[PDB]
Design a protein around this nucleic acid. Sequence first.
RNA 1: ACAAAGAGAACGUUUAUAUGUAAUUGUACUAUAUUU
Lengths: 136, 22, 45, 108, 389, 228, 463
Amino acid sequence: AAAAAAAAAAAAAAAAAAAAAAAAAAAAAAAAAAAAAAAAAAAAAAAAAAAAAAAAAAAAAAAAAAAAAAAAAAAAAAAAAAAAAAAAAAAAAAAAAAAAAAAAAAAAAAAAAAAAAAAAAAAAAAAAAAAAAAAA
Amino acid sequence: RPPTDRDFPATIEEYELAKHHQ
Amino acid sequence: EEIPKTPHAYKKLLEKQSYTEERWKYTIEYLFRKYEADPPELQDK
Amino acid sequence: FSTFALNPETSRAPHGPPRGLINRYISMGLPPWAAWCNRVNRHALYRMSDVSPRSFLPKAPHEMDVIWMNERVRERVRTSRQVQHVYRQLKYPFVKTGIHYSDTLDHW
Amino acid sequence: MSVFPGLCGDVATTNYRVFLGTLPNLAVEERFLRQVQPVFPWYASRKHVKEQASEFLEIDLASCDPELLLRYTHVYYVRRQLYDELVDRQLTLMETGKAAKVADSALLTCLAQVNAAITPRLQYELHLLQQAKKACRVPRRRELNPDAALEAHDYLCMMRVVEEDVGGIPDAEMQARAYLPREVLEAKVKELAAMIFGDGGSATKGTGAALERKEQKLLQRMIPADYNKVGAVEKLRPVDVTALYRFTGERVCGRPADKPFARALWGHVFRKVGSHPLYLQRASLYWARHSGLDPQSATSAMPADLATAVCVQQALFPALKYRCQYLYTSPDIARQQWRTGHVVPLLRLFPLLGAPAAEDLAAQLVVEGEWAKLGIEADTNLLHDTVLR
Amino acid sequence: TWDELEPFKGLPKPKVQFGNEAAEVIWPYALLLENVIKVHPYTKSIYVYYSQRQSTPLGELAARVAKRVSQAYLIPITFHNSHVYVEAEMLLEYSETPWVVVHCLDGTHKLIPVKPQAGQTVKEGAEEVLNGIVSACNEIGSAVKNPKEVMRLLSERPLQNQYVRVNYQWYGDTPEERMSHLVKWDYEPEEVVPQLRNRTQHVLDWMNYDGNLPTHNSVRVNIHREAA
Amino acid sequence: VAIVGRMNSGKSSLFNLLCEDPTMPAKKNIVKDFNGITRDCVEAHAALDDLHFTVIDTPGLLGGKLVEEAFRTVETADAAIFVTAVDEDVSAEEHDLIQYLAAKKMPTCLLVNKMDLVPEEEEALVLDVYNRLGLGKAVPFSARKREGLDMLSALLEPLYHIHAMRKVENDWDIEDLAMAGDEAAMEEIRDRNCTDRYIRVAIVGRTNSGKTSLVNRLVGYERNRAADESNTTRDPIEIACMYKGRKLKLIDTAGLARQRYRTDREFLSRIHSLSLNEIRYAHVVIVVFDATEGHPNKYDMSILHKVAQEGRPFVLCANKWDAVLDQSATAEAIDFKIKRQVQEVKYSNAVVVSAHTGMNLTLLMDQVLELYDTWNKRVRRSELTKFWRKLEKSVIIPYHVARVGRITQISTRPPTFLLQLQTKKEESQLPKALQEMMKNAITEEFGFRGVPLRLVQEVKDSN
RNA sequence: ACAAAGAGAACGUUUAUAUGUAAUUGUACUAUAUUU
Ligand SMILES: Nc1nc2c(ncn2[C@@H]2O[C@H](COP(=O)(O)OP(=O)(O)OP(=O)(O)O)[C@@H](O)[C@H]2O)c(=O)[nH]1
């Protein structure tokens, strides 16, 4: 139905984007096709689930507190507005290193069925829960 | 390769070499 | 002197007069733009 | 690998000899690939060495009219799809009507 | 950027974006090198704050050693008041230098660029060329200071204070640590690693070659950063002193004997007259740039509000060492105005070399337990080194 | 937009550098062959190192004679020998004396200091500077230890002078058609064989030879028709 | 998916292992080793272990106009597989084609063909200069040694799983526009409910004009092919889109007399055969020629009689008609030569067309769509018999030419009927004069002149 | 033969090209396929 479609499409959007004209790595081609069969990928299903909300709720809370950090302060913000975002957006861009850490530590395994669905998913939580205290 | 540079002589005409018998 | 029977034989004979009428173009470098302050406009706009 | 082997073993003298033909031709004005001619005897070699061109003039020299500088009518020989027979045909030069303006007598 | 073609031609030129993101390293002073030479407010300003916060990013985590000389910080805080007289002019020199620089050799991407926190370094560079009469004095004299030419020179110079005490070399893990600050030059065939002066005796930071010598060379050092520093600057002085730096500088070829001839193997006179002004300029500004972020407590929220410089080696020791830095320069001046260090054309004979041990020896026993007693002599030397005009 | 190097689009890329980029200047084969420099058969690499800034008024000249030897008297060493790799790199700093670092097939790199005497010229300067290498420093590579082991490398050393661009102006662009006036006997007999699926039938057409063959009957049919 | 066009036949030999269809593998794989053989963007079905998909070619760094035709067929393919020969590794255009692939966002895996030719040791080198290529890990491939498969193209598979899902979603959503309309009404049928048998037209004929010019106009004036208006030139085969009230595929070909054969690559080794093997499988043909020359030459009717002899239906099409001096009733020898002595190919309809002009390309769609309606037409067993006896009542066959009697019950088994002789139990066949005189009668009465050719088969009454 | 290339094609010639039947010709893992 529209369940497995929206259950996979949210877990494949990163895969279809990992082929950013490269498409060829260890897991960036193997562990993407492992979930395509949807076998033994029930941990990787729920793993990247929590990794989205933490990357959208950290995209909605900061973007306000980065639009509000100006409106609330407004002391010299109107004078140095360029130095607020350029610094803040970097911290928003330095969050992207969540991928190079997780696109390697997923490739750093010759992806077996479960021994990769377990030894990687359990890591993507420790890269997600890393953005628990970082959200403080 | 001591020789074999006799081609195009006026255009060539240039060498930097001394013959050694032994 | 020779009548070039071929467009290659002609376009080579052209490269001969370009040596007679522009001898100094070949005797050494035409003008070594390559080896005189190669990145000089890194400075001063 | 397989039937198309070509192992370290050699073909041992596959065909045309080094000077049995290649030097003998090279030393008379012909390329090495000229050895792969169909047949040759002492008079056929005399014809290949081009010692005396086998071409003629259309008219007697004293009565020729069209200016021929170094051109003579030369036959061309092209063979068959195999080497059973050859066709022959005379090959002529281009005779351009020369409309040249001569300065000495002011006219064309 | 053509002043350091050994550095940029070396470092990794990574590329994952249309901008070929080049790769510096925080520890090596290519940070200092990518801010002194350039004239591009783009990168001369950003990596400033990337470094500035990155300390503050790690400052907010580790356990620090601030105000360790707490009784002295108050006596330290008396020079912080009498320094905003010399530092007054020193910005004014660059206040018009940066703006009125309509010329060819040094163009900023905005010649109306107001002086910022980034400006000191790239502007400090321009004042150095000002005092001299030619360009460029530093690499031209990098030609006559080969690396191992100064190693054996700055080694025997240490034995003078402590002979039959060191033995050989500081350990490799320090040698490779002393590698990090020194820039990289052509490793090509049958050449050798020339050296800029700012390697030798730069009083900008703990950044002199011979300055790097003492802070680990002598064995009479202990965890108290005093015995290190009071003699650290003792090694700082000679290698910047004109009268020796020329007496000690031989040609690139004199080191391996590659040319049986040289226009003058010995380092010329009329050029080492620049390194010492390069060493003595911004003397008061040097203090403020350290004092500004010497106390770790103030460091937490002072810098971005105060006109001062920031680096990475600040974090190595917040105020145990870098506020003990406020100390060594006080017996420093107390030597050159007492043992006549500035104007000596010869400073190599044993009595001259046997004196600096006493300048420590008469100070270490004081700084041992009677810290308050050493303060006064250490206080006067700061009205002395700098005159108001 | 004109791809000036459209013939050399398949050749390797030279070691692109600051004073080594004049290895991709399109050399006319008539400017080459004006300098046929034949270095000792036991020479592996020739290196020239000069500077961009010089202070000493003689150093400003020494960095010029070494400059010219890179332009003129270095690539002919590559083009002709083809077992000598040649690299002239300028170091962007003050200096006095440029270097010349010549390697040998043993691994014995030697020293050549470019010290031109004061009253010399940039032309005479090179001849003194080049001779110091071609004779004094390369002919002394004939003191090799094992004259065989250091030879099998020469018969193994792949041709280094591919990257160079020669414009064989009006000369032929192919090694044989360039000669074109010399009998060779350098051919290897197997290579000369045609192998064109009807050899001795095309070969007879090229050199226009019948081969003792008989004329087709179509010939007398036409001669009978070319009568009167 | 689409292969890229570094100049060789590996992008053409990677196609080799992927071509699936009934009874005749469409071995388009012209792999002659002469630095680029494929000229046009040839596409065809593919099949690895499970994943079906359409591989495409993008050839032609050769002619200053010819690379552009790929740019159309590189954008329609939602993927690409850059292939690199280990002969030459890194170059200029093989790099500008990566900065391009990145410019257009299309994904791509890099695989390296001819991974023979390298020793067991010198592989760290060949591989590394390819990982640094930006495309990521180059994955080892070899068509000769049939490795580089089940581990290379069975790993592009992620794309197929996603592409199956992006389609079905569009099915969920192009259905939301199914109501009026203007489109998407029967377009929901043309995708899934449309179940025809793919009328396979074929534009055959001698190749002097870029006679795919005509194919291009019909496909959308679109220039999916190379107009070889330069001189006598070459194409490889092609297949294109399918509409005109049905699903009608188009192909392209080439044709010359055996004597004209120039060596091979023009005939017995490949092209003349590679074009005739695709008119033995072609539900219609269009024997195109160039009207400007005038009457169709002696061989231009030999393409008909072969199609006539293949049960196929045929049309004539005088392309380049506007460039003629409007020679109706003068260049109407095309409507006479097909009548003078041509045996059964006559009754054919010779349409008239010009590509640039568009002269009748719509009327041309009607002839082909009609012929396939006559190429499938069954007559009631009764209506035939009650018609032949009325023939045999008036024919001048004097029964010595044909001792055969009343052709008892002519039935029609398929496109072509069978004859059953009057209780003869004797010599079976009928003469050629009395053979066509039967087929001449049929096409007239029933209107079979769409395909004027049937295969009449004879048999006696058994015992 | 014609067109094509080649020569600032007033024409003369030498190559590359499919036309007419012009017109002569001829066409009954050791196995178990193949020579039409
Ligand atoms: N150049 C051009 N294309 C057109 C025009 N009208 C439609 N097209 C489109 O370009 C092609 C032209 O052919 P069509 O109009 O389709 O007509 P057709 O050739 O009879 O048949 P199909 O192409 O099979 O539909 C098709 O892709 C059309 O959709 C037009 O006026 N000019």
